Ligand SMILES: [Zn+2]
């Protein structure tokens with residue numbers, strides 16, 4: 243049955259009904275057979291023609307395995323009040339206000355039964371936990387603060403699956419040298435300079451608004467770096483004054499383990515001349531002959547269904 247409280251502001255009043263789901267909205271909270279914004283986002287994300295790069299590389303069963311790790315991060319210590327359904331015997335008026343209850347145990351069971359076709363659908367279902375807490379307990383209750391942090395963890399984990407599902411699973415399991423594991427579409431290796439930090443080796447995971455999502459060898463920290471401050475990996479080092487030599491040496495050692503792993507899996511790794519700029523979705527390091535780019539990639543391909 244249809245909800246009585248607006249999905250945006252969590253208050254009652256004259257509200258519009260979605261044709262596909264039980265959510266309701268004030269016309270003014272959206273600034274104008276109707277399908278709500280949650281249903282529109284999910285439909286686009288689950289259509290093969292408009293699905294994300296992460297969804298193109300995953301089956302529904304594979305996505306269910308990654309959502310189980312996201313549930314573990316959402317179940318932080320102190321989230322006890324949201325780990326099981328609200329006991330109606332202990333709050334006898336709960337169902338007079340909450341028509342669509344949700345909790346972390348129910349969210350975990352729906353993920354296991356392969357109910358979710360995209361990351362957007364898991365976050366949209368998780369959000370009933372916060373919406374219900376605000377209606378019943380109030381916007382300034384101690385439990386509402388806990389529910390807001392649970393939703394922010396869920397948002398972060400969905401964003402991490404979408405950046406690269408293989409990096410996500412490697413970071414979850416933490417095998418020895420997990421950061422040196424190459425992905426099926428290998429991330430280019432760069433020298434990256436962040437303002438105020440020395441030039442350092444990093445993996446380039448994404449390109450957005452003239453920036454590169456860099457993941458640094460050694461500490462495994464991350465930052466958006468300007469594209470003009472990124473060069474393809476080279477033997478000559480762009481020198482920077484550094485506080486501790488041994489930390490730089492460990493990062494370079496870990497970087498050389500990643501390069502040998504790449505050469506075993508794909509059969510090639512091309513270092514570039516000094517100060518060669520990084521370009522979006524660079525293919526230079528995988529070329530069969532770096533002086534003949536028209537010849538293309540070295541990857542032979544054996545029609546492998548390998549993935550899991
Ligand atoms: Zn509203």
Ligand SMILES: [Zn+2]
Nearest residue numbers: 260263278281
């Ligand atoms: Zn809807």
Ligand SMILES: [Zn+2]
Nearest residue numbers: 406408409425
């Ligand atoms: Zn990756």
